[PDB]
Design brief:
- The structure is a monomer.
- By secondary structure, this protein is of the alpha/beta class.
- It has 14 helices and 9 strands.
- The longest helix has 19 residues.
- The protein binds Nicotinamide riboside (NNR).
């Protein structure tokens, strides 16, 4: 009984890559004028949304979540694959459309209104109203501002962040990850970089884990490393998904960093046993900028020594995963300080404005 109730039904179309407040204002007006609204997400393989990593199936799921607390609003999918390109696609297209209306509606003798943004769709739809006992009307709505907003969001999400629907925000987020040995100032750097622009940041999970479970670096076993992989990943996703996210988040280490420690300190067998979880987790990471603190002259007591060992292995692995074009090495102390170098790198890779201190 997950069908739309009522007699006056509005049909609202979009690709929704992403959904934004322009859509939402129109939808809620439409829902105030009708007994219920059917949102139609249209798409096809390798369409505009698919090309930026938002294929039809994902936009449909995101919309369902976005409208998960609405009485009279249903979300449905119009799959446009395998259509004859010319005229005979219009018949089949409409068939699928009216099938969607039939399946997702409770009652009969409806009064249905299509909200349509292109003159071609209106004319083709008006010729193909079926004799199903419903009354149909097509209403032209101006979509120019909505389409332009969508285009501007895709070009520069950080400039239009507050208008992006929250379910879509993770996809468009910029992500800066800091990497380095223990006791090199990562945590101080992360917090200063993030606080400089009101961005959220994560903490190094390994430090929390060793305090909560009260164990030293040299007591870590294979299973601790596994828990640090998922623990750091969850902490990082939490910040990317945080409502405090304004478009840029800072991460204090990641699975690659943990993979460097594992490679250096675990027995070969135990490392090889963690490799699938490493690969899975590293594959789920999205990084735009990787800041590496190189070795120059609560404490991780064993992780302190052999900094150059850690750094060489880290650089090997960043090459192994093809990340070198996102890596900036903070070899200062040219810029005044490590912090000057990093905040400038943040500027170049995210677009955010940074104030000067001096003339
Ligand atoms: N670097 C990260 O840990 C990171 C960055 C962006 C997103 N995520 C998570 O992965 C998923 C997307 O693949 C999202 O659900 C994020 O939580 C993790």
């Amino acid at each position: 009984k997950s069908k739309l109730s009522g007699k006056n039904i509005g049909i609202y179309f979009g690709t929704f890559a992403p959904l934004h407040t322009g859509h939402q204002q129109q939808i809620y007006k439409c829902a105030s004028l009708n007994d219920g609204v059917l949102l139609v997400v249209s798409g096809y393989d390798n369409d505009r949304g698919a090309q930026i990593g938002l294929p039809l199936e994902k936009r449909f799921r995101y919309l369902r979540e976005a409208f998960n607390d609405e009485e009279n609003i249903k979300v449905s999918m119009l799959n446009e694959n395998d259509l004859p390109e010319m005229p005979n696609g219009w018949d089949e297209w409409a068939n699928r459309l009216f099938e969607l209306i039939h399946h997702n509606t409770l009652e009969n003798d409806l009064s249905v209104t299509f909200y349509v943004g292109e003159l071609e769709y209106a004319a083709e739809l008006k010729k193909r109203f079926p004799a199903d006992g419903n009354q149909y009307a097509v209403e032209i709505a101006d979509r120019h501002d909505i389409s332009l907003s969508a285009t501007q969001i895709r070009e520069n999400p950080q400039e239009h962040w507050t208008h992006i629907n929250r379910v879509f925000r993770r996809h468009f987020s910029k992500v800066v990850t800091v990497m380095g040995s223990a006791s090199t100032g990562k945590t101080t750097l992360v917090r200063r970089l993030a606080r400089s622009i009101n961005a959220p940041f994560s903490e190094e999970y390994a430090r929390e884990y060793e305090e909560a479970f009260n164990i030293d670096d040299d007591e870590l076993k294979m299973d601790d490393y596994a828990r640090m992989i998922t623990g750091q990943y969850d902490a990082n996703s939490r910040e990317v998904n945080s409502p405090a996210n304004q478009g840029i988040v800072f991460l204090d280490t990641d699975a690659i960093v943990t993979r460097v420690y594992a490679k250096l300190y675990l027995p070969k067998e135990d490392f090889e046993q963690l490799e699938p979880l490493f690969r899975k987790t590293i594959a789920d990471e999205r990084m735009d900028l990787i800041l590496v603190i190189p070795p120059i002259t609560f404490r991780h007591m064993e992780w302190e020594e052999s900094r150059h060992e850690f750094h060489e292995e880290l650089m090997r692995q960043l090459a192994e995963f093809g990340l070198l074009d996102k890596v900036v090495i903070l070899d200062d102390e040219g810029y005044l300080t490590r912090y000057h170098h990093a905040i400038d790198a943040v500027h170049e890779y995210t677009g955010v404005k940074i104030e000067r201190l001096s003339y």
